[PDB]
């Protein structure tokens, strides 16, 4: 890591602490993640992720395994979507830019998922934007590569807000549908400027989903009632109208949102099918203010 000088701490993610760093030789500016953890399995899986390249994924530039420590060197981008959404809390992100961001993120997901790689932990903090109007998925593949956690190294309440309902009901063998769910939630949030399902615990997370989309049953989700953490004793709320949930959004957008928020992960739209949705007939690539 001595080939790097630390500039600033960009944050403390699930996998330890991220610094903006300068490669003390090249002059190149990067994001340096020291992994807070040596297992051979993780090294191989991490090495496989280095070959994933797509303009919508933040590039894993170098994997440095030294002094039994793991450093991950990532392409550095200047902002994430959280700060960008905070900055424009008062005006709104204009819809064409929302749409552009949604279309490119789904492209990232289509690519990753075509490789059987999933994120599992998408959130606005993982979505990185530049001045050219690009948006990129960070931390793809890391969950499966390293193992999946409770509270972070920051001793921080991590984000269940974007968690798919099959994960919350204790499914061990979930699929790429979990990422579409999370993107669905982030799409809604961009539109309304408020988190769609801001749970303060796992059952509150699940109940906030139930209260808006209705309590799932065998009709909408075959197999639901025999999932590990499902309880017959769950309250039985009715589904709300999406015109109430993401109120200003047009019918193309809400129809797409609804396919991304299907309970049944096999009914839930693929990233590839979502790219052909009518919402994107008029997509463009606007550039943000920044
Ligand atoms: N809060 S901020 O908008 O100033 C900001 C946040 C993140 C990054 C940034 C650039 C590159 C990375 C790499 C990341 S983010 C993550 O969650 N895991 C990474 O490796 O993170 C830059 C600015």
UniProtKB/Swiss-Prot annotation:
The modification Phosphotyrosine is found at residues 15, 19. It comes from the Eukaryota. Mg(2+) binds at residues 126, 139. The modification Phosphothreonine is found at residues 14, 154. It catalyses: L-seryl-[protein] + ATP = O-phospho-L-seryl-[protein] + ADP + H(+); L-threonyl-[protein] + ATP = O-phospho-L-threonyl-[protein] + ADP + H(+). Binds 2 Mg(2+) ions. One of its GO terms (biological process) is potassium ion transport. It is an enzyme of class 2 (transferase). Keywords: Acetylation, ATP-binding, Cell cycle, Cell division, Cytoplasm, Cytoskeleton, DNA damage, DNA repair, Endosome, Kinase, Magnesium, Meiosis, Metal-binding, Mitosis, Nucleotide-binding, Nucleus, Phosphoprotein, S-nitrosylation, Serine/threonine-protein kinase, Transferase. The modification N6-acetyllysine is found at residue 6. Belongs to the protein kinase superfamily. CMGC Ser/Thr protein kinase family. CDC2/CDKX subfamily. This is Cyclin-dependent kinase 2.
